[PDB]
Amino acid sequence: MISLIAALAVDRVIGMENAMPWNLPADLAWFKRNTLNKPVIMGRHTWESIGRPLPGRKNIILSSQPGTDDRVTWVKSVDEAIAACGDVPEIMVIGGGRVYEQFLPKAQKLYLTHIDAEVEGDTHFPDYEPDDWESVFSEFHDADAQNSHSYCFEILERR
Ligand SMILES: NC(=O)c1ccc[n+]([C@@H]2O[C@H](COP(=O)([O-])OP(=O)(O)OC[C@H]3O[C@@H](n4cnc5c(N)ncnc54)[C@H](OP(=O)(O)O)[C@@H]3O)[C@@H](O)[C@H]2O)c1
Ligand SMILES: CN(Cc1cnc2nc(N)[nH]c(=O)c2n1)c1ccc(C(=O)N[C@@H](CCC(=O)O)C(=O)O)cc1
Ligand SMILES: [Mn+2]
Ligand SMILES: [Mn+2]
Ligand SMILES: [Mn+2]
Ligand SMILES: [Mn+2]
Numbered sequence: 001m002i003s004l005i006a007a008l009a010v011d012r013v014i015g016m017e018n019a020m021p022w023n024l025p026a027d028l029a030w031f032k033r034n035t036l037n038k039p040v041i042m043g044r045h046t047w048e049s050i051g052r053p054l055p056g057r058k059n060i061i062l063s064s065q066p067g068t069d070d071r072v073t074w075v076k077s078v079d080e081a082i083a084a085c086g087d088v089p090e091i092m093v094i095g096g097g098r099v100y101e102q103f104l105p106k107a108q109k110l111y112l113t114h115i116d117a118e119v120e121g122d123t124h125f126p127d128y129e130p131d132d133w134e135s136v137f138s139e140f141h142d143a144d145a146q147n148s149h150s151y152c153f154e155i156l157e158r159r
Contacts, residue, residue, distance in 0.1 A: 001089060001090050001091065001108050001109065002082070002090075002091045002093060002103060002106050002107045002108060002109075003090055003091065003092055003093065003107060003108065003109040003110070003111060004092075004093045004095075004100055004103060004104065004107050004109075004110050004111070005031060005034060005035065005092055005093070005094055005110075005111040005112075006094075006095055006100065006110075006111075006112060006113070006125050007020070007022075007024070007027050007031075007112075007113040007115055008112060008113065008114055008115065008125050009021075009022065009115045009117045009118070009119040009121070010115075010116070010117065010118050010119065011121075011124070012124045012125040012127070013119045013120070013121030013123070013124055014095065014096065014097060014121065014123050014124060014125050015049075015096060015097070015121055015122065015123040016119065016120055016121040016122055016123070017122065018045055018048065018049050019049060020049075021119050021120075021121070022115055022117050022119065022148075022149065023148070024113075024115060024147045024148075024149065024151060025146050025147060026141065026146065026147045026151070027113045027115070027147075027151060027153075030111075030113065030153055031094075034092070034111055035054070035057055035092045035094065036056045036057060037056060037057065038057060038058075038088065038090055038091065038092050039057065039058040039059075039060055039084075039085040039086075039088060039091055039092065040054060040057045040058070040059055040060065040092045040093075040094045041060045041062065041081045041082075041085070041091065041092070041093045041094065041099065041103070042059070042060070042061055042062070042093075042094045042095060042096070042099060043061070043062050043063075043095065043096050043098055043099040044061060044062065044063040044065075045096055045098075046094065046095050046096040046099070047059075047061045047072070049096075053071045053072050057092075058073065058085065059071075059072040059073065060072070060073045060074075060075055060081050060084050060085065061073065061074050061075070062075055062076075062077075062078075062081055062099060063075075063076070064076060078102055078103070078106075090109075093107070096123055097123040097124060097125070097126075100125055100126055101126045104126050104128060107158065108157065108158050109155065109156065109157050109158070110128075110133065110154075110155070110156040110157075111153075111154075111155055112125075112153075112154045112155075112156065113151055113152070113153055113154075114151065114152045114154060115149050115150075115151045116149050116150040116151065117149045131159075132158055132159060133156040133157065133158060133159065134156060134157050134158075134159050135154055135155070135156050136155050136156065136157050137153070137154065137155040138152055138153065138154045138155075139152065139153045139154075140152045141153075
């Protein structure tokens with residue numbers, strides 16, 4: 001099973017200048033909770049944004065070019081990325097925009113954080129078709145001293 005996980009600001013913005021212009025520790029905790037002990041697939045730009053291997057996860061990087069770090073696994077196509085995960089229950093695709101667009105048709109589950117923040121961005125989550133997805137979990141949180149925007153965690157499953 002392939003899942004996508006992402007945090008989206010208003011208008012589906014997911015990044016700006018290879019970074020994310022919000023700091024929401026509760027959402028990072030959610031990301032860790034839902035990805036630990038699973039393989040994670042990311043594009044090369046997201047690998048450079050994260051800046052180091054994510055511990056406790058098999059890190060698979062998509063790039064057309066040879067890899068430059070043997071602490072992670074480098075693959076050259078979508079099919080190779082999936083195969084490199086082996087026979088696990090759930091593969092997590094962690095972006096960025098180009099990678100989400102290629103894996104969305106293959107995904108059964110979306111883990112989305114909707115952040116109530118107006119962010120100029122240069123990268124968006126794919127338009128997906130709402131009729132294709134059932135919301136199975138949602139949990140809203142007001143802003144607090146640690147998280148400066150309200151946010152909603154949602155899980156959707158392909159109908
Ligand atoms: N809000 C969130 O949840 C979230 C999550 C992840 C990322 N982001 C943000 O997303 C932005 C980065 O996204 P992006 O769309 O620019 O880049 P991306 O999807 O991270 O990386 C694209 C790169 O991945 C490689 N790639 C993708 N598909 C491939 C394929 N089929 N075969 C081979 N290589 C492939 C290519 O590398 P080569 O050029 O080396 O061939 C391509 O240039 C940043 O702003 C980051 O902060 C946000
Ligand atoms: C840019 N990026 C890709 C990306 C994909 N999907 C996402 N989905 C959502 N919901 N929120 C995102 O921020 C998000 N980010 C990342 C991803 C992870 C990290 C990072 O440092 N993670 C640590 C933190 C553990 C903690 O603080 O509790 C860890 O996991 O151990 C940094 C940048
Ligand atoms: Mn092929
Ligand atoms: Mn197999
Ligand atoms: Mn806000
Ligand atoms: Mn599209």
